[PDB]
């Protein structure tokens, strides 16, 4: 029953673009009368940028531009239609609503849960969503928005950043969230933002464009958030967790064997109890509580997830908009979602029930996609 | 049987604790009455309870114990007699000469190196090593000490730390350096030490002892220097180089696919003619450039390393002696060691010809032992 799903695809929807527009402080976003897309500001490293282009608009124009590939929910549709995907579970984009103030973010989540679900009603079948939660709000307001979000048609999970409440994912007071969303059936997909202090890629970084923060950087807040959640025995306190990780886990497949190496050589956990012969290995975390998409671009790290997790916890993803063609048409199919289609067709064999599960038929079953 | 060489292991000789024993500021080592071992003192916050034990012969020792297995030559040929080890390139652990003072760091460098070839001196055939070099020198000095090291016996290489010369790999002051260990064919071995920043880490850190630091950090750190390498064109100016690379690369056979597809998708390099159609990629580096060790710990990471880099191109290590057994007799074998050799025979099967070019055949080839 082979049909293809992308669980890892991103969307600013009006109400979330008309509510950063209002803003004053970052992240906001800014129309210009000389381009045609509105401007998405995030770091204050480049609102210095912004007062050059609101001054000299010869100055380059400041941030991303929020452009239809995120915006136009035609737009996904057509994305879909020309890359061969019949569903897309969507989910909103960083910084998601990490920034807001705790008094005015329950409602602006709402709001916008309330028009993706709406988003998911035009296309009835090919669309679902993972809500982002208030998460600057008051715990007793994120599980009420938890609540409500589940009984929104179409919602099939959770969008969760790294930073959880501010202290990261092993932050005690986020035990209560997290049991609030494996009750509720709620898949939780784990997605990064922000990445690693840039210090660490050095004085020459600016040369090689984004590739670090990106290529790196995400990946690995991925793999230090999820092994956090694990030393804080996260998942063998909510045993009916579930976690859709980014980025086929960031490099948690590959580092595995390592973190278990580690566990067990050190001298504190052992001695202060930490370490009993019961404990449940990262190894069995991954794969009863951890899935993984496929956005890994490579056979070579596809295998090593596949090994991890099985063939059965895998999921295609594309990670549009964020990775364009620079030179082909964008309006025409995407590289970026061929390479690890690509992969997966090298890793498990074309028309094989294996690339069926994992292009689509995973997440049909895990999400209850009909 | 095929010869099993450990490519990944470390000492503090007592050349290099004799002078660290002499610093006055981190980092140093001072013995005490109340204890066999000599103590590691590593950071800022240690100096506060040195003081303190240095007073009380009741206070706690601070910093780490100097136990044999990092400073006996005898300590380490029992490691490698009780583990099935027949020859190692043995190698300066971290923090190695980074933090010398620019006049000092040469004449230390020295006398540490050559001591290094006399305790393989005393084995021969089952001891080699990697040479470390006095990077916060001047580069004619550094050139200096790589010229002096290349004719030491048993010297098969160079141990290189993630900062080079102060501002990480790809400091084009830093390309002679390259240019003069890969004329000298010598092969360079990057290790990390620095990791990541503590606080990307959290305020729970502590409660999972050192496990977030090592077991993230270290791979970590060694995946973001080699990546700043290869986007700074390193190994396309200097085509002879030869690096291999701690912990199966860090995280590098699991993101390469990665950096690739970033790479080809940067709009900053495909507009400024940085993406050529004729352009090295990563993984043409990884099979031409780039050893792999297999301190890995398990098959899935291992498969990954041998995909990327070949079979031919990965090379047995323990990381000795920064693991030991914490419950079973540290003078039996090694836990840390037997995980390695297992993923080794878990992925390319006992006995085949694959497992004897990773347990020691690879070393002997490339570093002519
Ligand atoms: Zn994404
Ligand atoms: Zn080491």
Request: one cysteine or more.
């Amino acid at each position: 029953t082979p049909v293809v799903v992308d669980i890892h695809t991103h969307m600013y929807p009006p109400s979330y673009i008309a509510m950063l527009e209002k803003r004053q402080t970052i992240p906001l976003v800014r129309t210009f009368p000389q381009a045609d897309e509105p401007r998405l500001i995030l770091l204050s490293s480049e609102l210095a940028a912004l007062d050059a282009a609101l001054a000299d608009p010869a100055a380059k124009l400041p941030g991303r531009p929020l452009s239809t590939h995120f915006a136009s929910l035609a737009q996904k549709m057509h994305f879909m239609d020309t890359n061969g995907i019949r569903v897309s579970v969507i989910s909103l984009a960083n910084p998601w609503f990490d920034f807001l103030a705790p008094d005015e973010a329950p409602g602006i989540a709402d709001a916008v849960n309330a028009e993706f679900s709406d988003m998911c009603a035009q296309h009835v079948g090919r669309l679902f969503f993972f809500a982002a939660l208030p998460l600057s709000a008051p715990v007793d307001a994120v599980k009420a928005s938890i609540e409500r979000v589940k009984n929104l048609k179409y919602c099939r999970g959770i969008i969760l950043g790294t930073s959880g409440l501010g202290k990261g994912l092993d932050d005690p007071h986020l035990l209560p969230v997290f049991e609030a969303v494996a009750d509720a059936k709620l898949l939780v997909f784990l997605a990064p933002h922000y990445g690693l202090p840039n210090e660490v890629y050095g004085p020459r970084s600016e040369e090689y464009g984004h590739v670090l923060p990106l290529a790196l950087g995400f990946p690995m807040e991925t793999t230090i958030a999820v092994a956090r959640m694990y030393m804080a025995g996260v998942f063998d306190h909510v045993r009916n967790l579930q976690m859709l990780l980014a980025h086929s886990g960031g490099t948690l497949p590959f580092l595995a064997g390592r973190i278990e190496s580690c566990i067990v050589h050190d001298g504190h956990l052992v001695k202060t109890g930490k370490v009993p012969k019961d404990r449940r290995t990262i190894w069995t975390v991954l794969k009863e509580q951890i899935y993984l998409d496929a956005v890994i671009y490579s056979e070579v790290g596809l295998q090593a997830a596949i090994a991890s997790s099985g063939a059965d916890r895998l999921m295609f993803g594309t990670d549009h908009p964020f990775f364009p063609p620079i030179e082909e048409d964008v309006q025409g199919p995407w590289d970026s979602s061929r390479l690890n289609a690509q992969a997966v067709i090298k890793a498990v064999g074309e028309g094989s029930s294996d690339a069926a599960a994992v292009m689509g038929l995973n997440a049909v079953r895990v999400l209850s996609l009909k």
